[PDB]
RNA sequence: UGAAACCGUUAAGAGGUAAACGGGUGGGGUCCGCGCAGUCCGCCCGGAGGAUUCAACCCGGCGGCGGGUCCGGCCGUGCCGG
RNA sequence: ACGCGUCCCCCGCGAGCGCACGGGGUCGGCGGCGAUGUCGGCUACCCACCCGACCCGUCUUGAAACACGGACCAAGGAGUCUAACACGUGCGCGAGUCGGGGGCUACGAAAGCCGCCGUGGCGCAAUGAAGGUGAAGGCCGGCGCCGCCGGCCGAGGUGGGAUCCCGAGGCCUUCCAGUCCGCCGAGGGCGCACCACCGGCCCGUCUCGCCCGCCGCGCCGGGGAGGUGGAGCACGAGCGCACGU
RNA sequence: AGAGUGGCGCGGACGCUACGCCGCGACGAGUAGGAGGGCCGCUGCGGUGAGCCUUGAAGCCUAGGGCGCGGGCCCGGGUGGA
């Protein structure tokens, strides 16, 4: 299961970074970037991710297809959202809630798709 | 699940053929990092 | 490994686990088994009674192959065959009996331990102890000897 | 496949699986054939690492 | 000085053993000779068996 | 679904409250009935002595049931019989105290430790201030506080000691579940005496503090609690 | 040959049999006491008796 | 100061299983849960056994397990063994039992399953019956290991029957001055 | 590359109970804050504007799912035949 | 002590606002001082004063000692490999286990393979100086006693023993039956390991008594009752690898 | 907080490296000597860091600034030159 390979990874991966009494994780689709069992971004059968879009403008989102969990060049599926900051977040809350697609992440993907725009907006 | 899928076989150009192998059971035996 | 041992937790302490008062000094009792009837008496005579003295006759050029006697009990005397001499023998009407040879599985004398699985059996054996005779005969079987 | 990533390897684009190939890779003596071949199956990125 | 319960036992290191110690670091390319000069043998004796 | 079940969910709540208001009146009527005892027992000891003194008699008042004990010497250097007897009274440190019922087996323990303690026969004021201010419990192998009446009703209960009022009766009158309601208590936690000691080493009778005081233990309590 | 057959204990915990044979939870915390001296404080003293 | 000692009051039970193997540590996780949230006992005894060390949990054999269910009554009932289930040669006829151990040795699979009786492991006794109903809790013998025949009253004293540590037995190896009435004394 | 011991010279500091050390404060230096009018983050209301823009309806592509009863194919530490 | 419908000695869901000695603190309160001379900075450099403070290692009942080594600084400087043993702990396989010598065919002097390469080691059997011996029994029939004839069950108690199994009775929303699915339970059942006590079986030895078996009829072989010596039986836990003491 | 047969507005903080978090009590001297834990140091070998370095590596120096009870470690400046 997922629950197996955690026991394997937990304290060993090439994506693990420790020091100064802290501890982090640099895995593709970890949104909170921390070595955890909610938040790891490869293990499971379904995945959410929020990446900063191609050029400057926008945000890009990442679901994991339920099917072929053994076929990685056709496993993730992509879409870009380049609209107003309150209205862009209509989409993302309408992905997690109304699909029933893994209802833990809700309030992680609202605080990551609002500190990817507060960037590309011009500086103080 | 010992349950086995079907394994596709790629040509040396990259596109897949239409030939498959049933999974060698070794690939279901336990992971044991110790 | 030289890291998980005691001697790292002791760089810093003086006496290193062998004493302030009476130190680690070379050989305090005498080397090896000393004091066998003096000052290491008690011990010797309280975990090794009978070290000190003679008994019995001495045989000189002892060749041990002449003394050679392997052993096979009853309970598990059916352990020298396949699982085919017993299931078809239990099926019979006229009442047959398979021939377990014990010289073929490195066994010389046949011993008398547990039960028997009760169905006819002829038994070759170089040495029959007195219970291996009376257990096999009461059930029903011969006792042929071999040399 | 979540294990093979964590040994660093560069698999995000690999078609599939535990990968298999027709028996015509056993006889290649040229590296320019075997390099072109490594770029087809989408794993050159691991050599490039 | 025997502590307590614990088997009595006689060692033969009272001689100068170290001066006569034998090791087998050779063990791997001593085999690979025999097998070579083994492999010489029967090319010398062609259709005669190497089983002799 | 629900519209039925929500009204049935507004019938069980008023039941658990009614379990309190039938119990809330009983805490009052238990306390107003012990007040009747503490004028009917108080004035019935002044009743007999006048009506003896009347006919040229005498009246010896009732010899004690109950006695408080406080440990005044320290913890260093102590003889091995006394360490065992001070343990059994649960006085394990200096300036600590306990309730103790009286008999022959109970006094002759208190003659072996009679230069490590001070004891005496306490009153209706030196029973309650101690049990009100200081008094803790011993629930789940812990010294957890009594700011409630579902700790004493909840542990003991079956003996009929529910509220803070019955811990006054059963101790101040040594009644018929005393043992359990006094091994109920953790021993008390008095700070030092504010005024002081007379001379700690010696027996009261000589000058100092040690040994029994029959009616002036009331002076080393309102100074210490 | 496997010690345990389904390592998946994200899913074994929530199938019909295991969630019809366990008592209910206790998700409340009970923080520590400050003993208001009832010889001084009124309503603290009206609660005892 | 307060007169107490701090002498034995760190207790020495074992809180968690020293081994590393993962499939035993998802095992425990299950039963940690299953101990605390039920009102059945079995679970708690099983979790405490999932910690112990090889020697405190020794191989129960087929012919003991066979022998422990042919007593009067106990039927419709399984047999849990938090070590193993090994073969026994001196036993022939095999009924249709139900087993649930950690390692089932590779010949006692070919015996009980061929008689028409299934074997489980520790996540097939976790859904089949969560609390614990229809079981007999068996173990093997914790006084098998020779070691126990060097222990007790020390072999050189009245009335005692211990094996001492001897380099080898023969006809002379510890054979004289405290074993014979004739050579000083025997005990 | 160029450490310590030990010297020599500039600045400061101090100086009758050999010096040096621990607790606790005061004075003076050195630098350092980049200090010298003082914090952001939502929703709400009033008053000045920007940008072709929101609901809804049809047009293609993709997922999340069960169609409590559509059709096949593929597994099996599942069996019953030949 | 405060509606009413019936039982009596004795003459089961009302409506809202509000204040607080009530399961650990908050002002829906204020004021000065701010650019080349002032704000702050516990920490690290120098000075000053009050209280405290004898030099370290060390053997020793006792060291600041009129007990011994120490003028200062660098760089080196002391429980270690291998051969036995034993107890504990991890891991593979389990009445078994193990190829360690031998073989076959850059990293590799590695690594996969033999099975009719397990010879062999340790283990599954004790006990006697030896010749040697070598590990349950019951309960009904053919002739109140032998010597033999059939049929059935079987590794034997008592006492304490983690858990399971049977369930008298009950687990509420107007009442009167009726159930399925779960849980709570008076007392009453099979008794896993570990022990304490009682019986038995194999070797050695001691005292008493009568019959068996025979190609060789004995200075021949075998059975029976009660004491006693053991590192013994009595439904098995060992073997290879690694770590620590 | 049981289940039946009859009489307008599509919205609601944090969590759970389960080898983690959280929850309420009692205690805390130590020489010979035991034991655990060390995100305390020093040098080598397999893995890993799409690590870092002539736009300045190691070592040293530093009345510059920070970190932990502690062993020790992080950053400013100057040297130095792989």
Q: Which two tokens stand for residue F68?
A: 């408080």
> CA-based Rg of chain H, rounded to a whole angstrom?
23
**What is the rounded distance in angstroms from the CA atom of residue F182 to the CA atom of residue E30?**
88
In 10 A of CB C50, how many CB atoms? 23
Between H22-36 and A2-9, two packed helices, what is the crossing angle to 10 degrees?
A: 120
Task: Name residue, tokens 């059968």.
Answer: A45
**What is the rounded distance in angstroms from the CA atom of residue G18 to the CA atom of residue G12?**
8
User: Are D19 and B10 in contact (CB < 8 Å)?
Assistant: yes
Largest CA distance in chain A: 47
Q: Which residues pair with F211 in a beta bridge?
A: F118
DSSP D11-45: -TT--SSS--B-GGGTT---HHHHHHHHHHTT-HH
In 10 A of CB F132, how many CB atoms? 18
- Residue A100 CB in 7 A reach of strand I: yes
**What is the rounded distance in angstroms from the CA atom of residue E45 to the CA atom of residue G39?**
118
Q: Which two tokens stand for residue A25?
A: 């994780």
Q: Which helix (H) or strand (E) holds C123?
A: strand C122-125
What is chain D's length? 49
DSSP chain F: --HHHHHHTTTSHHHHHHHHHHHHHHHHHHHHHHHHHHHHTTTTTHHHHHHHHTTT---PPPPPSEEEEEE-S-SSS--TTHHHHHHHTT--STT-EEEEE-SHHHHTTTTTSTTSEEEE---HHHHHHIIIII----SSSS----SSSSSHHHHTGGGS--SSSHHHHHHHTT-TTTTTTTSSSPPP-----SS--S-TTSBTTTTSSBEE-SS-GGGTTTTT-
Q: Which residues pair with A17 in a beta bridge?
A: A24
**What is the rounded distance in angstroms from the CA atom of residue C90 to the CA atom of residue C105?**
23
Q: Which two tokens stand for residue H58?
A: 């020794």
* Residue F209 CB partners (closer than 8 Å, separation 6+): F72, F118, F197, F198, F199, F200, F202, F220
Q: Which two tokens stand for residue A79?
A: 């879409």
**What is the rounded distance in angstroms from the CA atom of residue F134 to the CA atom of residue F126?**
12
Which nucleotides of strand I lie under 7 Å from a protein CB? 43, 61-65, 74-78
Report residue H161: phi and psi, to 5°: -140, 65
**What is the rounded distance in angstroms from the CA atom of residue G49 to the CA atom of residue F181?**
19
Q: H109, H119 in Cβ contact below 8 A? A: yes
Q: H139, G20 in Cβ contact below 8 A? A: no
What is the Cα F168 distance to its own chain's centre? Answer: 7
**What is the rounded distance in angstroms from the CA atom of residue H104 to the CA atom of residue F130?**
66
Q: Which helix (H) or strand (E) holds H25?
A: helix H22-36
Q: C136, C116 in Cβ contact below 8 A? A: yes
Assess G42–F contact: CB distance below 8 Å, yes or no: no
Classify residue F39 by burial, with Cβ atoms within 10 Å: 0-12, 13-18, 19+.
Answer: exposed
Tell me the CA–C1' distance in angstroms for H102 and J92.
15
Q: Which helix (H) or strand (E) holds H24?
A: helix H22-36
**What is the rounded distance in angstroms from the CA atom of residue E1 to the CA atom of residue F181?**
61
**What is the rounded distance in angstroms from the CA atom of residue F131 to the CA atom of residue F121?**
16
Angle at H166 between CA H164 and CA H170, to 5 degrees: 115
Which nucleotides of strand K lie under 7 Å from a protein CB? 1-2, 10-11, 13-19, 22-29, 31-39, 47-50
Chain C residues with CB-CB distance to E5 below 8 A: 47
Which nucleotide shows the minimum CA-to-C1' distance to residue C17? K33
User: Are H26 and A3 in contact (CB < 8 Å)?
Assistant: yes
Select from F116, F136, F123 the least CA-distant residue to F184. F136
Q: Which helix (H) or strand (E) holds B19?
A: strand B16-21
Select from F185, F188, F194, F182 the least CA-distant residue to F71. F188
Task: Name residue, tokens 């006229």.
Answer: C94
**What is the rounded distance in angstroms from the CA atom of residue F208 to the CA atom of residue F38?**
34
User: Cα dist. A17→A22, F173, H87 in Å?
Assistant: 9, 70, 49
Task: Name residue, tokens 């992440």.
Answer: A105
Q: H150, E5 in Cβ contact below 8 A? A: yes
Question: E52 to chain H, minimum CA–CA distance in Å?
Answer: 45
DSSP class of residue C82?
-
Which nucleotides of strand J lie under 7 Å from a protein CB? 1, 12-14, 20-24, 57-60, 79-81, 83-96, 101-105, 109-110, 125, 129-130, 133-136, 154-155, 162-165, 172-173, 182-184, 189-195, 222-223, 230-238, 243-245
User: Cα dist. D28→B16, D34, D36 in Å?
Assistant: 20, 7, 12
Task: Name residue, tokens 């590393």.
Answer: H20
Assess H2–F contact: CB distance below 8 Å, yes or no: yes
Helix (H, G, I), strand (E, B) or coil at A94: helix
Exposure string (b/e) for H143-166, b if CB count within 10 Å is 16 or more?
A: eeeeeeeeeeeebbeeeeebebee
Classify residue E50 by burial, with Cβ atoms within 10 Å: 0-12, 13-18, 19+.
Answer: exposed
Residues annotated within the binding site of H for Mg(2+) are: 7
In 10 A of CB A124, how many CB atoms? 2
Classify residue F214 by burial, with Cβ atoms within 10 Å: 0-12, 13-18, 19+.
Answer: exposed
Between H22-36 and H42-49, two packed helices, what is the crossing angle to 10 degrees?
A: 150
**What is the rounded distance in angstroms from the CA atom of residue A38 to the CA atom of residue A41?**
9
Q: C138, C116 in Cβ contact below 8 A? A: no
**What is the rounded distance in angstroms from the CA atom of residue H62 to the CA atom of residue H115?**
13
For H22, name the nearest residue in chain A, comparing CA atoms only. A7
DSSP A34-48: --SSSS-SSSSSS-E
Report residue H177: phi and psi, to 5°: -80, 15
Chain H residues with CB-CB distance to C51 below 8 A: 174, 176-177
Q: F155, F136 in Cβ contact below 8 A? A: no
**What is the rounded distance in angstroms from the CA atom of residue C79 to the CA atom of residue C74?**
10
What is the Cα C76 distance to its own chain's centre? Answer: 17
Q: Which two tokens stand for residue C26?
A: 């070379």
What is the torsion angle, in degrees rounded to the nearest 10, for the CA atoms of residue C99, residue C104, residue C108 and residue C113?
A: -60
**What is the rounded distance in angstroms from the CA atom of residue A70 to the CA atom of residue B4?**
12
* Residue D9 CB partners (closer than 8 Å, separation 6+): D46
Task: Name residue, tokens 């000189």.
Answer: C60
User: Cα dist. F164→F144, F169, G49 in Å?
Assistant: 15, 10, 7
Half-sphere exposure of C140 (CA within 13 A, CB side): 7
What is chain A's length? 124
Residue ranges in E3-46 assigned as alpha helix (H): 28-44
In 10 A of CB F148, how many CB atoms? 15
- Residue B19 CB in 7 A reach of strand I: no
- Residue C56 backbone class (left: φ over 0; alpha: ψ -120 to 50; beta: rest): left
Task: Name residue, tokens 């230069």.
Answer: F115
For A76, name the nearest residue in chain D, comparing CA atoms only. D12
For G35, name the nearest residue in chain F, comparing CA atoms only. F147
């Amino acid at each position: 299961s997922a629950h197996l390979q955690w026991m394997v990874v937990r304290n060993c991966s090439s994506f693990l970074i420790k020091r100064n009494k802290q501890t982090y994780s640099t895995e593709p689709n970890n949104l909170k970037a921390r070595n955890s069992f909610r938040y790891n971004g490869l293990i499971h059968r379904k995945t959410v991710g929020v990446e900063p879009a191609a050029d400057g403008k926008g945000v890009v989102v990442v679901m994991k297809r339920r099917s072929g969990q053994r076929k990685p060049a056709t496993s993730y599926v992509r879409t870009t959202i380049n609209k107003n900051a309150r209205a862009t977040l209509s989409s993302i809350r309408h992905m997690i809630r109304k699909n029933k697609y893994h209802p833990d992440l809700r309030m992680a993907a609202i605080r990551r798709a609002s500190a990817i725009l507060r960037s590309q907006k011009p500086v103080m | 699940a010992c349950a086995r899928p079907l394994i596709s076989v790629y040509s040396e150009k990259g596109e897949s053929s239409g030939k498959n192998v049933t999974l060698p059971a070794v690939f279901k035996a336990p992971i044991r990092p110790d | 490994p030289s890291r998980l041992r005691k001697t790292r937790k002791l760089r810093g302490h003086v006496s290193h686990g062998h004493g302030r008062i009476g130190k680690h000094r070379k050989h305090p009792g005498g080397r090896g088994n000393a004091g066998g009837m003096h000052h290491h008496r008690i011990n010797f005579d309280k975990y090794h009674p009978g070290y000190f003295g003679k008994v019995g006759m001495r045989h000189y050029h002892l060749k041990r192959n002449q003394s050679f006697c392997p052993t096979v009990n009853l309970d598990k005397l059916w352990t020298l065959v396949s699982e085919q001499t017993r299931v078809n023998a239990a099926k019979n009407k006229t009442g047959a009996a398979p021939i377990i040879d014990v010289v073929r599985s490195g066994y010389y004398k046949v011993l008398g331990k547990g039960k028997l699985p009760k169905q006819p059996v002829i038994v070759k054996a170089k040495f029959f102890s007195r219970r291996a005779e009376e257990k096999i005969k009461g059930v029903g079987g011969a006792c042929v000897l071999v040399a | 496949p979540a294990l093979v990533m964590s040994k660093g390897h560069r698999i995000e684009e690999v078609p599939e699986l535990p990968l298999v190939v027709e028996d015509k890779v056993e006889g290649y003596k040229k590296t320019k054939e075997a390099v072109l071949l490594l770029k087809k199956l989408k794993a050159w990125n691991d050599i490039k690492k | 000085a025997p502590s307590r319960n614990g088997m009595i036992l006689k060692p033969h290191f009272h001689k100068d053993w170290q001066r006569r110690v034998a090791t087998w670091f050779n063990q791997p390319a001593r085999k690979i000779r025999r097998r070579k000069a083994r492999q010489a043998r029967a090319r010398r004796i062609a259709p005669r068996p190497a089983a002799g | 679904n629900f519209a039925e079940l929500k009204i049935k969910r507004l019938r069980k709540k008023f039941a658990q409250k009614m379990l309190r208001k039938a119990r809330r009146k009983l805490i009052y009527e238990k306390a107003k009935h012990y007040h009747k005892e503490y004028r009917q027992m108080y004035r019935t000891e002044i009743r007999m002595a006048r009506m003896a003194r009347k006919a040229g008699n005498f009246y010896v008042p009732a010899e004690p049931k109950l006695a408080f004990v406080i440990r005044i010497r320290g913890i260093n250097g102590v003889s091995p019989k006394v360490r065992k007897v001070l343990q059994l009274l649960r006085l394990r440190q200096i300036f600590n105290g306990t309730f103790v019922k009286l008999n022959k087996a109970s006094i002759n323990m208190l003659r072996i430790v009679e230069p490590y303690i001070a004891w005496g026969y306490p009153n209706l004021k030196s029973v309650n201030e101690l049990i009100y201010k200081r008094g803790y419990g011993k629930i789940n192998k812990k010294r957890i506080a009594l700011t409630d009446n579902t700790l004493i009703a909840r542990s003991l209960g079956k003996y009929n000691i529910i509220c803070m009022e019955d811990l006054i009766h059963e101790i101040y009158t040594v009644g018929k579940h005393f043992k359990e309601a006094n091994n109920f208590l953790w021993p008390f936690k008095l700070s030092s005496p504010r005024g002081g000691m007379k001379k700690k080493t010696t027996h009261f009778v000589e000058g100092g503090d040690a040994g029994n005081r029959e009616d002036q233990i009331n002076r080393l309590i309102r100074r210490m609690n | 040959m496997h010690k345990m057959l389904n390592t998946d204990l994200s899913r074994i915990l929530k199938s019909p049999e295991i969630q019809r044979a366990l008592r209910a939870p206790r998700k409340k915390i009970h923080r520590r006491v400050l003993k208001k001296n009832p010889l001084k404080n009124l309503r603290i003293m009206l609660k005892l008796n | 100061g307060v007169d107490i000692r701090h002498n034995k009051d760190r207790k020495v039970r074992r809180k968690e299983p020293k081994s590393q193997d993962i499939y035993l540590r998802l095992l425990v996780k299950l039963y940690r849960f299953l101990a605390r949230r039920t009102n059945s006992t079995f679970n708690q005894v099983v979790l405490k056994r999932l910690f112990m060390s090889r020697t405190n949990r020794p191989p129960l054999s087929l012919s003991r397990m066979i022998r422990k269910m042919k007593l009067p009554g106990r039927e419709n009932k399984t047999a849990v063994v938090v070590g193993t289930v090994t073969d026994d040669v001196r036993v022939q006829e095999v009924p249709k039992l139900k087993v649930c151990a950690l390692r089932v040795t590779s010949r006692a699979r070919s015996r009980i399953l061929k008689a028409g009786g299934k074997i489980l492991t520790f996540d097939q006794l976790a859904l089949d019956s969560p609390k614990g109903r229809g079981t007999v809790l068996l173990s093997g013998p914790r006084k098998g290991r020779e070691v126990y025949r060097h222990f007790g009253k020390a072999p050189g004293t009245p009335h005692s029957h211990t094996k001492p540590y001897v380099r080898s037995k023969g006809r002379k190896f510890e054979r004289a001055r405290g074993r014979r009435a004739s050579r000083g004394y025997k005990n």
